């Protein structure tokens, strides 16, 4: 299959003590512009980091100067970390992410309900996050009284947004919820006859 | 911070001593891809489908955790043993979908500003401990604190209220979050 490569945490030369490390890959236009940033944190305090826009370990606090200067001195470490923009970021994007995260398309579940007056158009269980939700009343875009929630991250690679409309059901009206999403060849129109 | 389309957060390592407690995870656009169970030495994928589509050799996580343990020793000495500051956590409870009688649902308890990464999150339905619960790995925040989410599959009935119990060192006594 395809394999996930991590960054190589370069090594340094009641109470509790916490150390953290993380490698952050920032992609724009696919791989047309990658930016790679590794961060070394001691007790919520970032003290060393490698920023590929800089090209060198910089200390963030006084605790980072030994380790930044050290990791700069030895080329086996430095040039390897620099390469991890291609051996970690570019690798993971062009490989395992393309076969997983960047292939995931979950179509949304659009459901109009009436709470009590206020119509609630719930859009649930979709991926990725780009999505547009517009109300219509008898076929005219309503942008007044329309309040949507923020994008809610469920925690299982599916999002969910709720768009409430304020209205008053006159017999014969036709409200529609118009939902566009990249997992949808055509948009979704869910109607609600008054 | 930096602006981009996609953000892979690759190789998130945490180590904390005393106690020999670690965590090695991968994220993409905010969601966890997998973590490496350090005791079972195994890659637990968030989505099993992904685990069937790609792969990660958990030994890489194991070595990286070894390195981080080393760096933790050195930096522990170098700072004259400056210990860690405890952080008051903040819990909020809410349901996955809007509440509705007898409709199977998930009661989410989101706890933020966790540091150090040791929390005990207990569910208390009818003021009695409950557990089908699921809790997640620690997600790293921009301020290098942590947030952890505990869900709870439940059927809502009007009879029983709900509170999230949070146990942490930044808390003199535990803290309860009603619903």
């Amino acid at each position, epitope marked *: 299959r395809v*394999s996930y490569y991590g960054p190589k945490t*370069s090594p340094v030369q009641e109470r509790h003590f916490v150390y953290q490390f993380m490698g952050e890959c920032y992609f724009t236009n696919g791989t047309q512009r990658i930016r790679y940033v590794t961060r070394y944190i001691y007790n919520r305090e970032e003290y060393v980091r490698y920023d590929s826009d800089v090209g060198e370990h910089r200390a963030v606090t006084e605790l980072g100067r030994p380790d930044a200067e050290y990791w700069n001195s030895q080329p086996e470490i430095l040039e390897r970390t620099r390469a991890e923009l291609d051996t970690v970021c570019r690798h993971n994007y062009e490989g395992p992410e393309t076969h997983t995260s960047l292939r995931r398309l979950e179509q949304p579940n659009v459901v109009i309900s009436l709470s009590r007056n206020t119509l609630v158009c719930s859009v649930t269980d979709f991926y990725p996050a780009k999505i547009k939700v517009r109300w219509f009343r008898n076929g005219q875009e309503e942008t007044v009284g329309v309040s949507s929630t923020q994008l809610i991250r469920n925690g299982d690679w599916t999002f969910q947004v709720l768009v409430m409309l304020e209205m008053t059901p006159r017999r014969g009206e036709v409200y529609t919820c118009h939902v566009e999403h990249p997992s949808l060849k055509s948009p979704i129109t869910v109607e609600w006859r008054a | 911070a930096i602006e981009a389309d996609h953000v892979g957060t690759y190789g998130i390592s945490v180590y904390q001593s005393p106690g020999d407690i670690g965590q090695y995870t991968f994220e993409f656009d905010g969601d966890e891809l997998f973590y490496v169970d350090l005791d079972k030495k195994e890659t637990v994928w968030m989505l099993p489908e992904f685990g069937q589509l790609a792969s990660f*050799d958990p*030994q*890489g*996580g194991l070595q990286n955790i070894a390195v981080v343990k080393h760096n933790l020793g050195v930096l522990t000495k170098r700072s004259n043993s400056t210990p860690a500051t405890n952080e008051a956590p903040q819990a909020t409870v809410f349901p996955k979908s809007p509440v509705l009688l007898g409709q199977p649902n998930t009661l989410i308890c989101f706890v933020d500003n966790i540091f150090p990464p040791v929390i005990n999150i207990t569910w208390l339905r009818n003021s009695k401990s409950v557990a089908g619960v699921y809790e997640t790995s620690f997600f790293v925040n921009r301020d290098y604190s942590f947030h952890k989410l505990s869900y709870l599959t439940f059927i809502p009935s009007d009879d029983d209220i709900y509170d999230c119990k949070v146990e942490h060192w930044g808390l003199e006594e535990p803290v309860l979050k009603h619903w």
Partner: T-cell receptor, first 112, second 111 residues
Framework: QVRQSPQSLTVWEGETAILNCSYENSAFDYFPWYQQFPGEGPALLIAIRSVSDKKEDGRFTIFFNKREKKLSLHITDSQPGDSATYFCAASATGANTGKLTFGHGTILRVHP | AVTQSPRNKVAVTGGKVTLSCNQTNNHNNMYWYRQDTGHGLRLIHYSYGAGSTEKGDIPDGYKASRPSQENFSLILELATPSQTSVYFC???????????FGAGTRLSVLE
């Protein structure tokens, strides 16, 4: 796996020994050739990386073919002190494993 | 350097055989291989640092132990004649590209 041919080689003093290696997994990018003398542990002789096809170190030379996944260690003007076993290892370093998977080694005898 | 101990040993089937390895290179990765003709070098156990052990390709019959950064010990709790072989200890640095093998241990397990 890592497969080495031939299982043992015999060369005359002065000639060029050609020890061959081949790997299956294309994730491999680091290929260290270890050498072992009788009664001794093996020690890193000469190592190459997939980026460069050829590594030269005086008499020793690694030739690397990424396409055909094949390696060839050349020893030129071999002395009878080269009689020894040569293991060909490979590792996918990106996996951050620490495990090296060795070939079964070829046995070199150099006739004086 | 990396000195194993003992460098020769004879043990009856069913006895306990503790192969010790010491390493003075300030390395962290340590390995226990064995060598057999026709099977090359086969990794038995390895350890990333004090307190942890990892399972090699052939952990069956053997049990590692890393009480220190310097010391890495193979343990044969119930020796068998199939474990008669030449055992080799090694050590390397994190992400290292060189392995530093020991001298050797000829182990004879005999009925």
């Amino acid at each position: 796996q890592v497969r080495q041919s031939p299982q043992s080689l015999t060369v005359w003093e002065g000639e060029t020994a050609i020890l061959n290696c081949s790997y299956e997994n294309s994730a491999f990018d680091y290929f260290p050739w270890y050498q072992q003398f009788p009664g001794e542990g093996p020690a890193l002789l000469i190592a190459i990386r997939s980026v460069s096809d050829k590594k030269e170190d005086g008499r020793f030379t690694i030739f690397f073919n990424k396409r055909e996944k094949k390696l060839s260690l050349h020893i030129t003007d071999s002395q009878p002190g080269d009689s020894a076993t040569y293991f060909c290892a490979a590792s996918a370093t990106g996996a951050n494993t620490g495990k090296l998977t060795f070939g079964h080694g070829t046995i070199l005898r150099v006739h004086p | 350097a990396v000195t194993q101990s003992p460098r020769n040993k004879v043990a009856v089937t069913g006895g306990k055989v503790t192969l010790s390895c010491n390493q003075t290179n300030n390395h962290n990765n340590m390995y226990w291989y064995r060598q057999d003709t026709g099977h090359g070098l086969r990794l038995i156990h390895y350890s990333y640092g004090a307190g942890s052990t990892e399972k090699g390709d052939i952990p069956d019959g053997y049990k590692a132990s890393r009480p220190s950064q310097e010391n890495f010990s193979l343990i044969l709790e119930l020796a068998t004649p199939s474990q008669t072989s030449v055992y080799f200890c090694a050590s390397g640095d994190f992400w290292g590209d060189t392995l530093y093998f020991g001298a050797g241990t000829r182990l004879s397990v005999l009925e």
